[model samples]
Structure formats: structure tokens, C-alpha cells
Target chain A: NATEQETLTILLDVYAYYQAYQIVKASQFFSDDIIFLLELLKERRELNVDFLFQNQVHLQELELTYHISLLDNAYEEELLANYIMDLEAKLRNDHIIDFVRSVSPILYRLLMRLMQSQVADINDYIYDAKNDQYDTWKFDKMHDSANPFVQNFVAKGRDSKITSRSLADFIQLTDLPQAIKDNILLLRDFEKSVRNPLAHLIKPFDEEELHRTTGFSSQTFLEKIIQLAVFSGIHYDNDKFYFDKVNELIKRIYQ
Target chain B: NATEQETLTILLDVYAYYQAYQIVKASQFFSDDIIFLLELLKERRELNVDFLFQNQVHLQELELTYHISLLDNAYEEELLANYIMDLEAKLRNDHIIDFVRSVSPILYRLLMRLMQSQVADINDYIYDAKNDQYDTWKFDKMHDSANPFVQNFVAKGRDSKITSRSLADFIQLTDLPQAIKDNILLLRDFEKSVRNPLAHLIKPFDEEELHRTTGFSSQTFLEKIIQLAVFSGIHYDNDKFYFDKVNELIKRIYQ
Candidate 1:
């Protein structure tokens, strides 16, 4: 395999041609290198030096950062952040979690429709008036009886001693103890952080009160939920290559 | 501005780096050049020789077709077709038409929710039960009262003669006659060819019986409906540049 320098050189050529086209077509140059980087970043975002911190780390070497600063002022930090987001988005395509999280509208509705359709023909979603379980499960106007999500939770809860309550509880009914359950913990954390804020929506999900409620100061909470839900898909069991390259970049920058 | 040939040369450089990264990362190479082509293709798909027929038309010069058959056999036609699809999607982002069409789930749901929220206090969406207009408007389970789209149409239809029955009729409620209204005709066509098929789905939408009912042979019926809905948006009034370059490619190949 070629070294990091080799890939950087080609990326330079890629960026150069990319700008030339942008420049000649218009009066100025195309500033964003993100889209050009996406081709190689696809299905393997970690492998891209541009997406990885290798290129950015190399810039931080004082050697290039001082020189590069003469050109675009100081936008490398912002670019690196954008790189992570796009890479996060690019990787999420593997799990379909990104599309569900970030897509502005269409695909999401269709999936909800399909999911909702599965519970169709439910004329009698029976429930007692003083049902404690229903009260606990009920979030807002969507009644627990009509909600297929809650119904499944209730159905699955009717096992062993019947461990049931919230989404976290539902996931726990399928997990074991004695130590760590990051997978279950991931879902549990998401229910409190991301999921609750979504429905609470003082304004709307994300970029507003979403971050205000329960979320990260950096990166997306929507992104985090996907990371939680689709971590297994990301690992792909036999191939754990996704985050391996990520850690390498992290440590290489550390020293 | 640089000539088309100059841009094509740069595209070659861009594609090479793209594949070189792809190659070094894996054992083989990446063939799809569409993603790499998206940078310059963005905000201007017609300008890309790879997306436009210029590259392909120049290839069909016999010249390269018979000789260039040395590499990956023959896939230029398919790539060009994919190029158009991606371009259609990319262009639709400007008008948000593509996201509404191609997006599998989230953005669509959010938009629907926001739209549904607008008529939140409509507790009594009064309508005469055997109302002729209601009978004409009602399609599926969604009642005309609950349907904000129909509500808007009914409100808009209450003009001089009050000409409104179907969606086509509703659109005509706002049109003026001179000789032709391709703009209005566009909407009229979409009403039958796209919208009707969507609601009358025998199984589900797109790639299933979506193509069967009302669609295209060469391209996306969804793509066409967007063109109709957002024709003015695409035109952008003073800037009619989007499709002008398209017709240029068409004529260039006609000879």
C-alpha cells in the first residue's frame, strides 16, 4: 500500500482539477473540498486521509499550517469538523441511520408509513381505563393502544417476570448482566437524550432546543442515536475496520 | 471561460485520483466516477461533460468507441444514464424536489408533521357529507377535511365560476388562457401521471408498480413530476440556464 504522502499527493491533484473546473465555469474557485473527497470516502470513510486526521494532523505540524495559513486564513479547523460530519453521514449510509436522522423529509415518511402499515386493520386496540402500564408508556397524544411501538414493548414484556416500562427497559428484557452492556446502554442513553428531546420539541428537533435539552456540544445527537442503534452494523462482526483506522488517526495525532 | 475540452481534461485528473485512492485502499479499483463528478456537477450538472452528452457524444465518434474497448469493455452508456439520475437528484436539491421524491424516509416525515401542524386547531373541518366537491376530492382514507392540500384547493377554488373538481381542475382555478400554458400543463400532467399513481398504489411506491402505473421509459417519472412542480423554481426566472445547456447537448448530438 502507498504511504499517507502518496494519497495526499493524489488528493492535491483531485482538488486542483476540481477547482479548475469550478474556476473556469465561474469567476472564482470552488472552496469546499468535501464533495470531491466523498468518492474514495464512500464505504470506507476512515481510509480517506482527508477524512481522517492524517491530513489535518500533518497540517498541525507547524511546517504546513504556517504556510497554508497564508492562503485561506484559518479554516482548517472548520473543514476538519465538516469532514467528520460528512464522514459520519457517509458511514451512516451503511446502516441507513444517517438517512433516517438527517434527511430533511421524504424517505423518512415512507419508512414511517410502511412501519405504520404493518399495524393496520387494528379496529380494537383494547386497553383498561386505569392501566398503569399504558400511563407509563404514553408520551403525548399518541395513545399506547394505537402505538405499535408500545404494543410490541407490552407484548415482549409479557415474558419471564415480564421486564417492561420504557424503551430502555424493553431493550434490557433482551440483554444480560454481570458487567457492561454498551449496546443496551447506547439505546438507553438515546431514549433519554435524543428521543425525548425529539418529541418534547420546544421548537423542533435539532439545531435549536434539541441541543438545549439533551445533546452534544459537538457533533449530532441524531448522529449519536444512529451510532447507538447501528453500532453492530458498523462493526460488521468479521470486519472491524471502520473505527480501527479512526483510532489510528486519533493516536497518531496524540503524540 | 475554459473550453469544454479543458474541463474534460480536469475531469480525467479528478477521476484518476478518485480511483487511485480507491485502488490503494482495496485490492482492486473503483469504477463509478459519478460521485467524484458531483463537485462540479453540483449547482450545474449540465456543465459537466461526463454528465452531459459531450463526453459520451465525443466517445461515439467511432474514434474512441472501437479503440477504447480495451479497458472495461462497454459501460459508458450505463454510466451516462446513472449520471443523469444523479444529476436529476443533485439539481432537485436546489428546489428541494429531489429530497421530497428520492429520500427514503426522515425529511418527508418532518415536513408532513410541520404541514399537519399548520392546521392544528381544525377540530371541525366542516363539509356536506354528500358534497359533490368532497366526493371529487376524497381519494383514500385521508378525509378532505383533514387534508390541508384539499382545504387549500377548496379555498382557492372559490372564485368567480368556482371551477374545481380534481387536482387538474383546482390548478385551472388559477390559470389564465392565451394559447398554451406549459407551466400549468406541467402541473396538469403531474396530477394524472404521478400523484394519482402514488395514492392508488397497489402494493407500494417506486421501483415496484410505481413504474407500472404512470412513469417514464428513459428517466424517472418522479423526476418529471418535480420538473412540473418546480419548473419555475428550476427556471429561476432571469436565470434560464439550467435547461438551456441541456438542449445544447441534445442538438449537438442530433447531427
Candidate 2:
């Protein structure tokens, strides 16, 4: 019952933010990184190191001000602080803890599809070093040897070692060329950083890293995700908060 | 007249094998790696180190047998051996030398595009570690401190370094993300290995090094080249041996 209630509450919050397109405020409830991402989404550009560094300064100042404000008004805010204490108590019991775990794979699958789509045209331009030709026909199309596709392939019988498969096994199982597969694998490995909020928090992800991975501006990546999510119907208020289009795309690629 | 004769001879040989879909014999006149690629094109499989090793063994044996044949039948094969010696002496001046230099840039451009294509999807799946979320958005997209687009808000005379630069600049500049740009530069550096037969013969390019750069099987890499070449109209015979498709692709992506 607690799980159901908390989950519903969290979902409602997500829905409200998504519906109003108030990603900034909505992100505040998530994590500091999400808030930063919200800022990027609003801007639509790559992460500039200097700008990113400036944001850190602003956040530190605001955090300091908030603490000072609370201390200055401690006596007056006692009653208000008492309610805050009560809210923290209730928020901890929030079985919404499972939310990140539940949505981890969904997010992974969706992001993977988006990632694959980003490189779809790569096959057209890839050159073959040996034959001295471009890959307009993808004769040497690379594959993620141990990518989600192959992991699932191996997981059918050996479920636990899905992430630990050997390079030789990867080579044996798939016939994809180097670059395609390497990038696919690169994206797959990257998905782990975003797998769960807990994981994201334990070792916070970085925008500079994202800039290196996607070659797009952080804002551009956010736009793609938001656009893809909307297009794929990945909504909290939707049927079970599941994405039918996302599932279908995954099935088409893997099944 | 000499250039025409040698060029025609080379073209006819390439044409015959290419038309017959016999990539094996067709690649014989090219580099050793090219021959390996032909095998991959014929078979949709990754390069097997063991299989490649076996071919090397066979090549060594054949080379040894030719040496023995020359010595064992010295008197009987005198006229034939003399002609063989004469052929080698003249083969160096055979202006078929224009081949490698002419096609080097075409190959380089193709591979550059391929390298960029390799990481096209990296951004989509990249998680911002500092932000604890996928970098679907960015607050700092431009890097040029005085980009025209943002200079009014920043400084003048130095508009942000637009990501959409021409190919010439791409090959020359150093501002791109490391992996994408590094590998493109790697391909450019590797071009020297394929630029001259004399250079290749003096210090043959190692497939192991190629593997490190792009991570594709050597044979698979070759197949992409063959497939792209056929698609792009890079053949031996024509007056305009280069393909407009290749040129157009490069121009559109870089220009």
C-alpha cells in the first residue's frame, strides 16, 4: 500500500511537470544533475566547460544563502521547521525508492533505440580501410558484439554473465564490423551511467562526458530524448506508465 | 602511351575479377590486407586470427617454393626466368604508380566520414556524471568565446566555433571531441600506410594497429571498402575513375 501510494504520488509529480513542460521545477524533485540537465534542455546547446563551471558557483551561493536564511529565521521558522521535519519523516518511508529500479530498463531500452537511430546513417559514410571504399552498402557494418542484442542473445541461457562476456565470444557471436559495433557497445556501456537514479547519484554523470559521447550539444541530446520519449509515448500517466512504441522498437530490433 | 598501356592492363585485370565477383583474385594485385578483405566480403564473418595466421603460413610456403623453383630448374627455366627478372626491373617504372596517390584522398575522406559515423550515437547514450542524468540537454553548447550566435551575449570578433565546419577544416582543426576527431586523425595518419606501395612495402601497416584504431576485424574493414568502392564507382578503367557519389557525400557532409 505504501509502495502504491508513493509511486502514484511520484508519478503524479512527473506527469504534472511533463504536462506543463516545466522541466526545471519538475527536475528539482529529482537530483541536482537533473536540474542541471533541465537547464541544458532549456538552452539547446552543448556543455561549455566554462559555463558548466559557472553553474557550480551559482549553486554553491544559493545553497549557502538557503542555510543562512534558515539559521537567521530559526525561531520564527520553528513551527514551519517542525512541519518540514514531519515531511522528511514521511518522505523517507516513500517506497518510491523502487521507482528508479523499475524504470531503469525502460529508460535503458529507450535510450538505446535513440542511440541506434543516431548512428543509423553511419553505415552510409563509414570507410573500409582495406578496400578503400565507403560503406554505402554496409558490407562491413559494425555490430555491438556484446551489445543489448547480443547480451540478450547470451542471456537466454546464461543470464548472470550477460555483462561479462568475453571479447572472443563477442567476436564469435556477431559478424558486425568494427566501428558500428564499437560505437554500439560504447552506447551500451554508457547506458549504465544512466541506469538508475541511485547509480547516477553514487557516481554522478558529467555533461562533458556526454559531449564526448554523443558529439551533440547537451541541449541537443536532451531535445532528442524528450522528443523521442514524447513520440514513443513514454508517459507516467499512460497505461502502466510503460512505453508501447519503445517496446515495439526494441522488439523489432531484438526479437 | 606507356601510362595508357599499363593503366589499361591494370584496369582490365581489376575489371575481369570484379565482374566475375571474384574478389580473391581481384585483390591479389592490391595489398595483402585487401586480399584478406575480399574473403570477408564473400563470407559474412569477423576476421579469425587463426584463419589469418593460416593464410600467412600458406603465403610463406608459396614464396619459398618459388625461390626453390627458380634455383632447381635454373637451366630449364632460363628464358622464362630471364623474362621474369626483366619484368621485375620494368615493373617499378610502370606508371600505375598514379593509382595510390590519386585514390589516397578519396580513401582518406571515406574513412574520415566512416570514423565520424562510428561515434554518431555516442551522445544519445552518454550520461552526464555531474548531473546524474543523461545529457539530453546542455546549458553551454557553443565553445567559441565570441561566437556570432552568442557574441552579443558574450564577446565580439570570435563567434563560437560552430560544430558545422567544412571537411577541409575538420581535417585541419583540433577543436572536436577527442574520440571522434582523434580517430579521424588516426585514419588520416594511417593513410600514409596505404599512400605508396614503396612505403607499404618498406614498412607494412600492421592490422593490429588498425584494430586498435577502429576495433573492427581487418577482413571486415576490407569488405566495407570493396562494397563502397563498387557503390561509388571507383573502378580501374574509366577516364574519371573516381566516383561523384563519394565526392558528393564528402562535400555535403563537410562543405
Candidate 3:
């Protein structure tokens, strides 16, 4: 009984360790954008993506209320462009904003594609891409080959990005809270559970795995990720303490 | 058989009358902001409303594809603003556009309240302010209690200089399409129709008296009248022939 308890405790610790690692990895996704935003926030850059996002959300929110529907993709793009215009209303982003604006449409197009591949009801759907892990594969596996990053998680290949899942798996059995471990194990399980099979095999999933994974791909999951970002920014779980600290160091470094 | 056909034809004509009335109303609902848009065939004021509505449908389509929800009321208002911004960007609407922009929020807020009064989802709602002749007694009894113009439509009473419902109501029936009349007649038989009672109150139909009585209204239908003016420009329907002849005259003047 003592030995079993020790095993459970070790796995829990491993889960916590890896879970923390995954949070940091998730943080990296936003780290670049946030860093840029922080710099802009400091220097008062003429082009600020953070402000752009805010204004876009503001204008887009109004359009939804008045029941204004676009007839085509051009209008949709036009509306989005106009929202960006509000952000650039001062005509200040003559230099940097154009580059940011150029990237916007592509990002929007990609997001639209991912959304089309993923969600069902536009009003009923919520997309929180930052927290949602479903896009991890979509992000990594865009080249149609087994994603080296995801493949590394299953330890099926050595070339993969061995940062987060392995970290989570390492601390799965430990003295930490089970909630952290559940989050850790779930990330690994979700990756290995769906992606491992889908990676190597060209064949379709058997009905059971297909059903479970299909259920996982709902707008609610994407929504949760987006909502999570609002609260936690990018760091998932307990490693927020780490991001907060890093953010402080950066603030001091630039100041 | 001939008598039945004759009766059906007469009802059909009445239905056609109502249909025409409703389409103009629908068009007015959409085109209230810029009737001049429909008047011009060449490069004219870009109908942001058309684009806004299309964007909504696009969002819905995207939602269907991705299982994401994007429709919200605040966003709809933002969309109209966006349209205005686009129009502004195009360097159009020199003098008249400013006033439209100033009152946009007022229009949105007013329509929002109207949406709530009907207790319908904002997206799936339509405003048809006419009441039926048969229901006029009950309608007047409820409202004779209080003028819809004073209590319901206009903010202040007895401001003759201010726009009122009598003007709105008089203009409401102008430039209507035949299809909308048939649809309204179908709705008249349906319990869910909001128009039937209002129509009865406004234009008293002598259904029992064999179509031989004067139309009556105690409180001036100022709200209806003003809405028509605000929505469809004052001379829209009555001056249709005159407008056409004027267009010909203008061609001679300019061409």
C-alpha cells in the first residue's frame, strides 16, 4: 500500500511538472505578440495590434446588433478593413500599420478556414483559439505530414518539439493537486489519443475514436480557449506566476 | 364557380394591394437611411446596409461551416457604423451624411426598444406597424387609454414641428410590393400576426358592413406618418410617376 501511494504521488508530481511546462509552451504562442504589444504600449507605436483588436471588437460588436449581414466575402473583408481603419483613424500607422494590416487579412483568412473546418453555428459558437488545444495539431500539421512537434509528444519520433507534453507526462504522478494533474494528463492524452493514430495511418478512425474525437471538435471548445485567453492571457494553469514574473522582468529591462 | 373566382380575384387584388404596401415597407426598413441609393444605377452611395445584412448571412454561413457563433446585437450596430465609415472613406455624403451619423445611435436605441416590445429575437424580427380595421375597437380601447404616438412612438406630444406618427402612418403604405400584401393576408389569418390589430385600428375595414364606411382614427397616426417620412423620403410613392418624368427632364437638362 505504501509503494502504491508512492507511485501515485510520483505520477502526480510528474503531471504537475509537465502541466507547468505546457502552460509555458502555450505562453510562447502569445509571447511574441504580447512582447510587441508591450513595446508598443511603451513607445506609443503608431501601429498597435492590441488597440487594433480592441477597436475591431468594438465595431464588429455594433454590426452584430443592427442585423447587418454581408452579401459576400469582399464585404466581409471590407468591414474588417474598416474596423482596422477605426484603429488607424488618426492616419498614424502610415508605416507599420500597413504591414500589420496586410497580415490581418491572411490571418483572418486562416482563422476563417480553421473555423470552417471546426465550428457549426456562428452565433452559438465561441472561439477561444489561445486556450483550445485542438488547433495545436492544425498549427503544427499544416504541411500534411506527421507533425514533428506532435509526433515528439507520443515519443514516436525524436525530431518533434519535446517541450510541453513530455513535461506534463514527467510530473503526472506526484504530490501536487489532481486538478493540475488532470489538466496535464488530459493534454497528453488528448494529443496521443487522437493525433497519434491520425498521424501514421492513412486509414479512417474506427467508429468509437472517431465519435469521441468528433465530439471534441465543437465551437464550445474553441470558445473556451478564447475566453481563457481573456483571463489568463496565454499561460495555462499554475505557470501564470512564471509569465507574470517574466512580464515584470521585461517591463524592467525596457524601462 | 364564376362568383367564387370573382370573389377570389377581388381578395387577391386586396391582397396584392397589401403585398405592394409591405415590400415598400420592407424596402423602407432597409433603405430608410439612404433612398437615393436605390435611385442611382451608376456608382452611387455604397449601401452599407446591404453589405451589413450580407455580412450577417455570411457570418451565419461561416458559423454553419465552423460551428461558431458570431452574431450579436452590439456587433450589428458597429456594422452600420462601419458602413457609414466606408461611405465616408469613399468621400461621399458631403452635407447630408453628418446628420444621419449624429442620429444613428438614436435610431439604433429606438429600434432596439421596438425589438424588445415585440419580444422577438432581434435577428428574426420585423416591424410592421399597421393595425387591422376589425381589431380597431380593441386596439383603440387599449391605446385610447394612451396615444401610441405620444406614449409609444414619439418622445414628446404636441410638438407639431417635431416629426410625428400621423405622417409616418400615412407614408407607411406607400410604394409597397404586391407580394407583401398576400403575405400579410396570410399572416392576418395567423394568430402570430402583430399587424392585423394595428391595421384594423388605422384603416377601419367594413368587413361586416360590406366595404362601405369611412376610415377613422381618433389619435393622429403621427408615428406611422413620421416613420414613413423618415424611412422612405416624403414623396416616394405618390411621386413615382413624377419622379420618373423628372428623371427624364433631368436627362434633358443634363444630357
Candidate 4:
């Protein structure tokens, strides 16, 4: 009913609370480029996505500028990144800390997806005319197919990775091979002991500390995690976004 | 136009989704005792709080039964509790595991309250007529003095303890005692290495494992947390709920 600019303004207004709460950052969503693109349309009737697609580069530059400012002062995004820069300034010799902290979150994302991958294998939620287990299956169409509590659990898990403990507990109950079982167990210990506290600045890092705790270099940790994805079951190719970011962070720092 | 029973029914129905989702346990929050208490009014026109005050013990018994059933099967509450019982029968010698697992959550709750107590010291939000730091103050009557982002951070801290790292980071910045700083730092490391993984069943526990990891007996951890409260700034007497629960857990297992 409204012009494209007006409609887009109204939609952006809806996210004003998110911006005010700072739950989402400025220009992360609802960038000023939308208003510019809308002006280019000469007062079109409705908002269109194709316009942004055509002008992606310019819009993306705006987003990149916002992220760059965040890198300058905002530690809200990740504690590790902030502290890594602080640590680098204090002990200026090692720039590998930059790559380690950057890639740390990348490993974190992959680890949870691997856990979720295992959970997904056991997670069958479709309802059909045929089902085997009578206790769970002998229900009318009116019955709730999913356990709402489990669904709540899964949602919290996927959001915050708190279900790392629960999903891992369930996986240990399953009959996975010894090598894979040991692999995740090792990764789990490394996460709890090393990655988590380091992410929080609970401890300082050195090659000796890294070598003693993780038994690998910072670069090797990334490669080993990828090796995990390769050997374990999750579709690693589907991790395109995380893998791309991981590769780029490593390259940028490695160079 | 609604009678007291109708009012209570509507109130109970408000939590029906919560019941269906099992986000809350059955008989939690909106229990059938309210219905019984309502009926006792003999068609009274309004709901009353005094009625609930009179019948709490009987109502509380019903809640206890629900908790007992959860102990029988619901690991949805805490994976640690469910697996502790499993490990108990597998070994059949140590009921101490029961106390340890139960007290684990008790300590977990205390740890956050400790962090929250520190956060509360710095969490003054009232605006005043006097102004100093004009960047944050020197505003007209209409300015939003409370930063919504900081409020979000505070709320998440008080709720789920996710602000732990941030709060800890800030505390490390502040001038505190050598002992208190070292104490929390020790607790932080212990929690990361031992409690979290053990809570998830990443590894089985023996007393030697406990000693090696935490450098103290299981009983000592609870007492040490209390010592932290005593030595540190938080009001320990205010933690009647957790402290009472901790004592009962310890004694119930000790006996």
C-alpha cells in the first residue's frame, strides 16, 4: 500500500527496538543503502530484494565499514578477539595470536555442528501412517509428534551450544567406532580445558601452553578440526560459510 | 464476572502451554492444589492469597511427588543427576556420587550468584540531578539514562550466567585483594576443568581424579565456595535457599 521507501522505513522501524537494545548492531541489518537503493527506484510501489542483489558490493562495503569500527573499539562481538588484540599490543612479537583467536570461534562453530550432526542422526521427527514404536507412534493426527521439552532443549542447544553436554552424553551411549569416539572425547576435553577459558581470557597462551594443552600448533588445530569433519559424519561441504571464514582468517594471518 | 474457581482456572490455563512444553514440570507453578483451595471457598467471589498460605504443606507434598518421579526417569532436568544414578548402580559402592552431582548444581548456582554479587556492586542504574561524566549524564529529563545494551547484558548475566566471562574480565580490571582474586581465578579454572565436564559425563570420577583435578575433596569445594562468600563482598546470609540446599545435600549424603 505504501511506496517502497516508506514500506522499507516501516520495516526498519520494527527493528529499531533491536538496534536500541544493541542486540543487533547498526548497519548489520537495515543499512542506509536500502534507502539509497529505494531512492534509485523513483518511488516504486513495493520493496524488492532484487535491487539490493544488483548493488551488493556497495551495500556490503557499508557493512564492512561498520564491522571495521567494531574491530576498532567494540569487544562485544567476541571476548577473544578483543583480548587477542590487547594481548598482541602487550606482547607484540606474536601475531599468530590473531589467527588463533580468529580461528577459535571457527572451531567452536564446527564443534557444535558436529555434535548437532550426531544428534540429527538420532533425531527423526517425521510422522507418517507407518511408525514402529507403539509407545511413541500409536497416536492420532492430533497428537504432538515432537516432545516439546526436547524441542525446547534442541532450540537452546542450537542457539547457545549448552546442549554440548547432553548431546555428547547421548553419543557416548551409542555404538560409534573407538577412533571416532576417542576423537570427540579428546576434542571435548580440549574445548573445556583450553578453548573455553582462553576464549574468556582466563589464561594467557604461548606455544608451550598451546603445545602442552592442545598438543598442536594453532594452525594445526584448524586443520585437525577439518580432519575431524572429514572423518566424522557431518557434511563438511555444507559448512561452506564457516570453512570459508576459517580459510580466509588463516590466510590473512598466515601471510 | 468470573468466580474464584473460574479465575484460578484461567490462571492455571495461562501456564498450560508451559505444561505441554514441559519447560516446567507437571504440578509446577499452576498446580491442582489451587483448584482444591478454590473449592474450599464454597463459591466465594474472589481469589485470596491467605488460602494458599494456610495449605502450603499439603500443596508442597504434591510438588515433591513430581520431583520424585523426575528422579525416577527425567534426565531432562539435569544430565548429571540422571547419569549419577546410572553410575551409582554400575559401581554400587558410592552414594557420594549422588551428593557430588546434586551439590554440583548447588555450587553452580552459588558461583553465578558470586559473579552477580560483584556485578550488582557496579550495577547502579539510577540517574541523579548531579552530573559529572557528561557523556553519560548532562541530559534533559527525557534521555534514556539506562543503556539498553548494558541492561541486556545484565539481564542475561542474572538469568543464565552467560556474562560470566565479561563480569570476570571487569573484575580482573578492578582492584581486589590478592587472595580474593586468586580464589575466584582458582574456582574459575576448577569449574572449567572439572565440574563442567564431569557434569556432562565426559569422564568418570574417582577420588584420585577429584583430588588431581580440583586439588580438594568434594566436601571441600562446597565449603570453599562458602568461604568465598564470607571473604568476598556478597551477602551470604541472603543465600538461604542455596546454602540450606547445600547443607541438606551434604548431610543427607553424609548420613
lDDT winner among the candidates?
4
What's each prediction's TM-score? 0.30, 0.16, 0.17, 0.26
Please tell me which predicted candidate would have the highest TM-score against the true structure.
Answer: 1
DockQ-based ranking: 1, 4, 2, 3
**Model 3: residue A67 alpha-carbon error in angstroms:** 11
Native-contact fraction for each model?
Answer: 0.00, 0.01, 0.00, 0.00
Candidate 1 lDDT: 0.31
Q: RMSDs, each prediction?
A: 19.4, 29.7, 31.1, 29.9
Candidate 4, B64: how far from true, in Å?
Answer: 28
lDDT by residue for model 2 over A1-255, one digit each (tens)?
Answer: 122223223322222112112433543334453344334222211111233334555645643743311111222222222222222221222212122122223233343333344344422323433443221222223334324544434443432211212222343344444543453444344344332333222111233334564453333433333333443333222222112222222223322
DockQ of each: 0.02, 0.01, 0.01, 0.01
Candidate 2 segments exceeding 4 Å error: A1-104, A107-172, A175-183, A192-209, A212-255, B1-255
Sorted on TM-score, highest at the top, how do the candidates line up?
1, 4, 3, 2
Which residue pairs in candidate 1 collide? A104-B107, A105-B107, A105-B108, A106-B108, A107-B103, A107-B104, A107-B105, A108-B105, A108-B106, A109-B105
Q: What is the lDDT of residue B233 in candidate 4?
A: 39
Q: Tens digits of per-residue lDDT for model 1 on A234-255?
A: 2121123323333233223322
List model 3 lDDT by residue over A171-239, tens digit each: 343233565445445434544454333321122222233346645432222233223222222222222
Better of 2 and 4 by TM-score: 4
- Tens digits of per-residue lDDT for model 3, B146-165: 33332342332322221112
Off by over 4 Å in 1: A1-169, A172-214, A217-255, B1-219, B222-226, B230-234, B237-255
Q: State the iRMSD of every prediction, in order shown.
A: 16.6, 30.7, 33.4, 21.6
